[PDB]
């Protein structure tokens, strides 16, 4: 069955805020563990540590976020999982100082997230797959 559209929106925007914080200048790598687990957590966690190691950071402007589809699979006492398909329109700037100019992008892309509810009532993003447009 379908998940509430605003609840998927709030999950994806907390993820996007945490991504901005972890990849940002303050380098809140710990905060990734609030929203991510498993392979997605490992990937973004190594990206955050690499960025902080090379003294680069990221600035974001999230122009549009829209939940295209959202489903929840309450698989009994084994836990629950969910799948969210969202279209992101976002601009970003990598502040690196070993180059004369900072690299920027503006991208509209679809992304599917697979999340799993932990046994504490909280949701955590576990896997993701982009299709860029």
């Amino acid at each position: 069955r379908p998940m509430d559209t605003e609840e998927a929106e709030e999950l994806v925007r907390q993820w996007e805020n945490v991504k901005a914080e972890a990849l940002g200048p303050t380098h809140q790598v710990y905060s990734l563990s609030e929203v991510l687990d498993e392979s997605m957590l490992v990937q973004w966690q190594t990206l955050a540590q690499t960025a902080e190691a090379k003294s680069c950071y990221w600035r974001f402007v999230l122009l549009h976020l829209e939940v295209l589809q959202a489903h929840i699979f309450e698989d009994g006492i084994a836990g629950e999982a969910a799948e969210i398909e969202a279209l992101l329109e976002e601009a970003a700037e990598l502040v690196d100082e070993s180059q004369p100019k900072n690299a920027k992008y503006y991208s509209t892309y679809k992304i599917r997230y697979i999340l799993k509810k932990q046994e504490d009532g909280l949701w955590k993003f576990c896997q993701s797959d982009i299709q860029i447009q």
Binding site: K54, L94, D96, A103, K104, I132
Partner: peptide
Amino acid sequence: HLDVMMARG
């Protein structure tokens, strides 16, 4: 090295 597009997701 790092590329700016690594932060989409």
